[PDB]
Amino acid sequence: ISMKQLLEAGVHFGHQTRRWNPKMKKYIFTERNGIYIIDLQKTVKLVDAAYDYMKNVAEEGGVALFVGTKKQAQEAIKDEAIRAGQYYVNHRWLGGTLTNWDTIQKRIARLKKINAMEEDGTFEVLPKKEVAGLNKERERLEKFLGGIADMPRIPDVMYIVDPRKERIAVQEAHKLNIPIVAMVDTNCDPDEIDVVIPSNDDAIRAVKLITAKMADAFIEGN
RNA sequence: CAUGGUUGUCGUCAGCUCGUGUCGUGAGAUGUUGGGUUAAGUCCCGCAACGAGCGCAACCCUUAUUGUUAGUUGCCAUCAUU
């Protein structure tokens, strides 16, 4: 991967000063007009590193779970997850998604049941007022649990856009000894992450670029 | 004031709990709170929680209009007679 690609994506931009976590001085290059800038050679080296690591994961056959919920990532991450065949989250992370897997699996079964009845069963016995509520239940379940339906087990790696916004899944991975890849920025904590990738939080192009490299990592490990 | 069973009340007010998970040294919190809404934790949206049960509501009775089947011990318009 190049550096001009990163520049075109706008990766080198971070958040304003006053939110600047000092742990990321390891990766801050400078600031421009009052906004800190990320060290791009180090960023490229870390990108290639994480690419190799996640390729090793997909070669060994582990499972991968993506996370992005803000306005700027919840479509590109879905795109690349569907490309790679690995699972994803595009809306609110459910507290207990992994720690309470045995309970969440019941609601996944409920989703499968509603689908198999309405569309594979095609029963239409019960009336309109009830089936409408059922369809809205299906809508919510597809909104939240839609990305982890057939995911057979907990992941062996969790790719995340923003750890501050996704403070829950980070903590769940910590509880479960699950490794984290992260699009860290100039306000987040890297010490909560096993494989850091410096980046910007608010660049659709950047998110698509990095997530495309991860999807390529998986497809080229398999 | 040994008990069962039965019952009154708070109160037909809408609240009380649980499993799993998370947070808290812990007791405990969360869920059950927040924005609206409802007669109602009723419903939705949101959220470190997901859900579920008891309850609410509904399924029940009666009244409120009416189709059909039935027409005596009930009823009398079309008719004649008391």
**d(CA A40, C1' B12) / Å:** 69
The enclosing H or E element of A29 equals strand A28-31
Q: Which of A222, A98, A106 is nearest to A169 (CA)?
A: A98
Query: How far apart are alpha carbons A202 and A35 in whole angstroms?
Result: 13
Q: Which amino acid is residue A167, in one-letter code?
A: R
**d(CA A140, C1' B51) / Å:** 14
Query: How far apart are alpha carbons A186 and A20 in whole angstroms?
Result: 6
- CB of A121 under 7 A from strand B? no
With beta carbons less than 8 A apart as the criterion, state whether A40 and A11 touch. Answer: yes
Q: In the 8-state DSSP scheme, what is residue A116?
A: I
Q: Which amino acid is residue A145, in one-letter code?
A: L
Query: How far apart are alpha carbons A181 and A194 in whole angstroms?
Result: 7
Helix (H, G, I), strand (E, B) or coil at A157: strand
With beta carbons less than 8 A apart as the criterion, state whether A97 and A172 touch. Answer: yes
With beta carbons less than 8 A apart as the criterion, state whether A189 and A23 touch. Answer: yes
| A92 phi, psi to nearest 5 deg | -50, 135
Helix (H, G, I), strand (E, B) or coil at A176: helix
Query: How far apart are alpha carbons A116 and A163 in whole angstroms?
Result: 36
Strand order in the sheet with A28-31: A13-16, A35-38, A28-31
Count how many residues are written for chain A: 222
Q: Entry resolution in angstroms?
A: 2.9
Dihedral over Cα of A169, A172, A173, A174: its sign? positive
With beta carbons less than 8 A apart as the criterion, state whether A73 and A214 touch. Answer: no
With beta carbons less than 8 A apart as the criterion, state whether A21 and A189 touch. Answer: yes
The beta strands (E) that lie in chain A are given as 13-16, 28-31, 35-38, 64-67, 157-160, 180-184, 195-198
Query: How far apart are alpha carbons A26 and A36 in whole angstroms?
Result: 12
Q: How far is CA A61 from CA A82, A137, A139, A166, in A?
A: 17, 33, 31, 26
With beta carbons less than 8 A apart as the criterion, state whether A14 and A25 touch. Answer: no
Experimental approach taken: cryo-EM
- CB of A85 under 7 A from strand B? no
